Design a protein around this ligand. Structure first.
Ligand SMILES: Nc1nc2c(ncn2[C@@H]2O[C@H](COP(=O)(O)OP(=O)(O)NP(=O)(O)O)[C@@H](O)[C@H]2O)c(=O)[nH]1
Ligand SMILES: [Ca+2]
Ligand SMILES: [Mg+2]
Length: 164
């Protein structure tokens, strides 16, 4: 079956595990986050295509084994939290790590501004749109809490993989 291997990266506590578990289990993780990084699989229909997603949840430095885990990704979600400025600034470092590991400057990737249920945001949508457009990648706002945008972010990443 058609399989899309996706990897979720970004700074601590931006919601990588929460986005992943929302996609897989439709559940919002409140207190019990996996903390230990794992791989999750699910058969979904994306734009009429039945396919399998394998999602690797990553930890929020450099490791040869982490490169080995990341090298298997076909596409990447770079997640920040819209109420945490440092996590947005950190996006540059995660994108640099992907480019190195994939040996490419055009890796299928989506910028994810998570926690968009929080109207008390420190990163404005316009700033993230600017950054995304300068990278040449989509930008999607998500909430793992309300589930808004969650499937949109993963499926848009699949679309980027398809057209690469
Ligand atoms: N309000 C709100 N809280 C969220 C959202 N996503 C995650 N959270 C909360 O943010 C905290 C961090 O989430 P978590 O999934 O553990 O993030 P992480 O990026 O996996 N952290 P780590 O880097 O330590 O693995 C949790 O308490 C979670 O409930 C969201 O969209 N909205
Ligand atoms: Ca594949
Ligand atoms: Mg986590």
């Amino acid at each position: 079956m058609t399989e899309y291997k996706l990897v979720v990266v970004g700074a601590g506590d931006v919601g990588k595990s929460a986005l992943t578990i929302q996609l897989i289990q439709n559940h919002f993780v409140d207190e019990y986050d996996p903390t230990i990084e794992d791989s999750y699989r699910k058969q979904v229909v994306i734009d009429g295509e039945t396919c399998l997603l394998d999602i690797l949840d990553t930890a929020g430095e450099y490791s040869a084994m982490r490169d080995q885990y990341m090298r298997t990704g076909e596409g990447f979600l770079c997640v920040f939290a819209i109420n945490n400025t440092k996590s947005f600034e950190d996006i540059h470092q995660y994108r640099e790590q992907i480019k190195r590991v994939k040996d490419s400057d055009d890796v299928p990737m989506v910028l994810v501004g998570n926690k968009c249920d929080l109207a008390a945001r420190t990163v404005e949508s316009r700033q993230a749109q600017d950054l995304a457009r300068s990278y040449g990648i989509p930008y999607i706002e998500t909430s793992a809490k309300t589930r808004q945008g969650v499937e949109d972010a993963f499926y848009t990443l699949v679309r980027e993989i398809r057209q690469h």
